[PDB]
């Protein structure tokens, strides 16, 4: 007696429907890009909009126990990376003057490890913000053809892949 799907249409017993387990609405398989045989291979179904919302909220949901452990393993893999040599530790002040003269929010993997250890981060977005802060500081301070900058590029690319499927 009701209207279903993104296409707002009443039930048609001759059409293949699948139910979203998040929103409990029903969708034509043809409208959300899943056929019956593909549907047979999955336990829960999640509709495209609901799925978008889940993808978007991964960076915003509270960090759990396992998430924190995961962040520790991520930093470890980053610390072991060959192009991670410039980011392992804070810049030695009595070594690079103008570094702290122009960078007022430095970040480094050791400091990030400390922040993870004491649960300074509560959302994945905060952790990602600090990692990005490392690479952007670097790219702001160094020329784009320099090894420092390019190292920032390489490790950021590695990082983005390592983060996939995290939550």
């Amino acid at each position: 007696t009701k209207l279903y799907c993104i296409c707002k249409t009443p039930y048609d017993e001759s059409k293949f429907y699948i139910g979203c387990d998040r929103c409990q609405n029903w969708y034509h398989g043809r409208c959300v890009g899943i056929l019956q045989s593909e549907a047979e291979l999955i336990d829960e179904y999640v509709c495209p909009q609901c799925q978008s919302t889940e993808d978007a909220m991964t960076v915003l949901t509270p960090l759990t126990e396992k998430d924190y452990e995961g962040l520790k393993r991520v930093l470890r893999s980053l610390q072991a990376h060959k192009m991670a040599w410039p980011f392992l530790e804070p810049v030695d002040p009595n070594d690079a003057p103008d570094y702290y003269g122009v960078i007022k929010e430095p970040m480094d993997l050791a400091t990030m490890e400390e922040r993870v250890q004491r649960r300074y981060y509560e959302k994945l977005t905060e952790f990602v913000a600090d990692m990005t802060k490392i690479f952007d500081n670097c790219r702001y301070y160094n020329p784009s053809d320099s090894p420092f900058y390019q190292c920032a590029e390489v490790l950021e690319s590695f990082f983005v892949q390592k983060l996939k499927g995290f939550k």
């Binding site: 017993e13 336990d43 829960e44």
Partner: peptide, 6 residues
Amino acid sequence: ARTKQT
């Protein structure tokens, strides 16, 4: 999954 077929 939860479906309705013909």
